[PDB]
Design a binder for this molecule. Structure first.
Ligand SMILES: NC(=O)C1=CN([C@@H]2O[C@H](COP(=O)(O)OP(=O)(O)OC[C@H]3O[C@@H](n4cnc5c(N)ncnc54)[C@H](O)[C@@H]3O)[C@@H](O)[C@H]2O)C=CC1
Lengths: 357, 372
């Protein structure tokens, strides 16, 4: 059975749904792994690294997908509606696993249905302990949190750590995190090891135990809490906002007003800029300089860590798929009763199985 | 007594030779401090912050250095030939303190002489324990080593620390620091903060203890350097070092080169041949790029990609951390000047017997002192 991985065509996407380690396991299961040439370059994965692991390199995506029984991608395929029709390249009746937007994209689903393609929307993965190893949202958000801090320190004109030197001492950077989700947690851990003083906040107080767990200071003041956040913000150096609730615009945690009171040289990294942004001043894909403050709004953050994001994404897919491989008959048999299968399947045999729109 | 600090005008310089804390110290010493308007913007220091510290703001740099008895700058003033004649703005007989690049910028030196200005090239500061607090090279390089790691992490498409997630374990980054001077030391400490596995190498055996004390491993090449600083090393060594460094360079993800040799061009530590055997996606941060570079592929002010490796050669790295580099620079100047402000009588008399004075002063009252 053939499994193909094409190069991500959507501008800005540099991750790839494969890694040499996974290629070895796929071949081990009985698959022939085909990868579009140049697919992993963005992720520091050369065509030679992949062929050394057991993969065959195909030129162009049409070639790679022409006879693939299984297709893995990072972002959902493009439709003729967006130009290049990637769905028409997938064999009819083939299996697709990738972040399908699922919730918000109708045309891709309609397109998949017309070709009788069974598509599993990895991002819809049931939130059960046993499926944590197949959860892409988590793996990518973890790296996204780490990178928020890195980009924060790169844009900051001060050093994160407190440095006591012959020439005086460098005070530590003060980092404030809005959103103690998976990403928020890594932003806290990363800002901590760099030596910053880390404050965290979230409307969900159940996180209070974890913020303190990593060394952060939960901000406790319930709306008189807003004054408790303006209090910390006014003396904050790096504000990292990760309030992204998949399937809904992002909350406005920092108004242009809260920003005009911040200090020059301060930095705001809005990880939720795609969904509007926790800060209305952030502009998708740019760094705005307002009131002396830099508002960072990079688009594909996990792609900024593509070389680590890719191997993890590839293992989430392998974890989700391995339980269903026969190998002895070299065929895929997705157990319909499996909760990870029925929950992520958005279209099968020409029928839309999931209601979202 | 008036001390003035103008805005740095050279390309890309965001630092400023002042800070509110230091404006406070100066005023207490009996000084009238004047800072040119917007001189600390690139350093995140507002005119308001300097005013609250007790400083006066002058609309123009000309106005600020007009009556100034002492002038503090980050980089050497520009000559009439360079467009803006800053030397001309300096009051004749005044004292100037800054990184003069004297040894390689004679025109600015003799230009200062023609105005009988007394200049102390802070970069020449004697290499001695009691000077550590007045040494700009150290304060600036220490921040540059930290920055090299931030710029390194920024260009790297992988995470520095080992990540243990539900999707699996991702090993930590492997860092190799070439030249464990002030910059290399902070690079190691900062690389270790982010959780990387750190390797390091230097020609000075004294550095082996410092590297291991930070959790890093030293790469010994031979064993069998100078009066503080390093010398131009031999080829038997130079070729044996490369051979021993390559054993590790092939696993290295981030290589930070900080090797410098007083006078001579920076030593080449990573050849193109060596870069060709590194892992795709690796990053080389060349901090000696301005002195020639430790990697022949580095290009000043650019990020080059050769053989799948990113060669980063940013200029004026201290300015990349300008908001912390400036208050330290200002403190180096303050610590250098303080011992000379007479108290029994109150004026500025630089005692010439002072090693930090005889060594930094390159010109005094129309006469040049030690250009050879
Ligand atoms: N006030 C004081 O006492 C000062 C003391 N120092 C001391 O000086 C030493 C280093 O001085 P830095 O300012 O960092 O000067 P630097 O920038 O010249 O140091 C470069 C580093 O690269 C090394 N290096 C040179 N050529 C090399 C080659 N071919 N291969 C491998 N490594 C090479 C040197 O040994 C040195 O550690 C430390 O011991 C430091 O504490 C430095 C400044 C002031």
């Amino acid at each position: 059975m053939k499994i193909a991985i094409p190069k991500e065509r959507r501008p800005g996407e540099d991750r790839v749904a494969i890694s040499p380690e996974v290629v070895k396991k796929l071949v081990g299961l009985g698959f022939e792994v085909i990868v579009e040439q140049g697919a992993g370059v963005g992720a520091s994965i050369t065509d030679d690294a992949l062929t050394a692991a057991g993969a065959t390199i195909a030129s162009t995506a049409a070639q790679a997908l022409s006879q693939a029984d299984v297709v893995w991608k990072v972002q959902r395929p493009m439709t003729a509606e967006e130009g290049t029709d990637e769905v028409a390249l997938i064999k009819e009746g083939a299996v697709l696993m990738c972040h399908l937007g699922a919730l918000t994209n109708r045309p891709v689903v309609e397109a998949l249905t017309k070709r009788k393609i069974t598509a599993y929307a990895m991002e819809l993965m049931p939130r059960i302990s046993r499926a944590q190893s197949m959860d892409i949202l988590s793996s990518q958000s973890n790296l996204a949190g780490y990178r928020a801090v890195i980009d924060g320190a790169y844009e900051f004109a001060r050093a994160f750590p407190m440095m006591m030197t012959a020439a005086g001492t460098v005070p530590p950077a003060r980092v404030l995190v809005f959103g103690v989700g998976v990403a928020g947690l890594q932003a806290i851990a990363t800002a901590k090891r760099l030596g910053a003083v880390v404050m965290a906040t979230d409307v969900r107080a159940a996180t209070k135990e974890q913020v303190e767990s990593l060394g952060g200071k939960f901000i406790t003041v319930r709306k008189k809490q807003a004054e408790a956040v303006l209090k910390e913000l006014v003396k904050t150096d790096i504000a990292i906002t990760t309030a992204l609730i998949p399937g809904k615009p992002a909350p406005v945690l920092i108004t242009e007003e809260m920003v005009t009171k911040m200090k020059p040289g301060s930095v705001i990294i809005d990880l939720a800029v795609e969904a509007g942004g926790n800060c209305p001043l952030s502009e998708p894909g740019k760094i705005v300089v307002k009131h002396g403050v830099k508002i960072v709004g990079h688009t594909n953050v996990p792609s900024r860590v593509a070389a680590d994001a890719s191997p993890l994404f590839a293992k989430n897919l392998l974890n989700f798929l391995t339980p269903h491989v026969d190998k002895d008959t070299k065929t895929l048999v997705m157990k319909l009763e499996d909760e990870t299968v029925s929950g992520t399947c958005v279209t099968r045999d020409g029928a839309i199985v999931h209601p979202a729109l």
